Amino acid sequence: GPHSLRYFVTAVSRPGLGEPRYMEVGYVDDTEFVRFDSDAENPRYEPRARWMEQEGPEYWERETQKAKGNEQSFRVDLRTLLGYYNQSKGGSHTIQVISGCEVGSDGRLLRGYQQYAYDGCDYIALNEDLKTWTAADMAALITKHKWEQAGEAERLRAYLEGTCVEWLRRYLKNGNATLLRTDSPKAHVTHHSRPEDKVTLRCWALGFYPADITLTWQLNGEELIQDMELVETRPAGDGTFQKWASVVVPLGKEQYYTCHVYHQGLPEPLTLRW
């Protein structure tokens, strides 16, 4: 199937408390693999996945230097945006960026992306064509004009189609035992009473990877996505994920409801009952 390399970058100013906090977190698919945090003593790029032990010391030195340079670029951007938006220097503001590429099973590029946000709202983003930008407001339009004059899209496109894709292929090769594995979900149902003649049935799916999964509740063969309650799929601390979905049913009629679990590690979907 397809695979992705994504970097989540955050710069947060803190007036009166020194320099902004700067963080970079990288993921290959749903697995965290590298991280940089300016608030750590002796800030350096660090491995977050076991297979990254395969890179030499040169890799860490180069990524650390790049991170420090990027940190400084965002310090300047925070000041620049205060000007664009005519805001005071006493408040905290945030810049967020998501950067990355996706490749198919054959390793060829499927899509690239680079999106920025300021204080939690869209700022500017590279369009799917990897040639033009989409600006959310007049401040971002200033940035758009600067980037067009500097040829930023061409520079970024070269990174997305070249460097990004080539390194993603390498990470998938080196971490194959971890990244190309499939951990099948193990499920079970819990039961809880309610004040009125009804009960809550909760279906749990545990220990699976990758993260994509589908949990549904059925009645007479009809899906109850409309009356279903659930949580977003979440990490469980060891590289696997979990999720649950619940429905409220009449007491004494719990046997008519079934939970269905669909996942890459389930040749045939699971069907559970209380």
Binding site: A67, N70, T143, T163
Partner: peptide, 9 residues
Amino acid sequence: SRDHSRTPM
């Protein structure tokens, strides 16, 4: 691997 030498905002 991370990108670098980006154009400022």
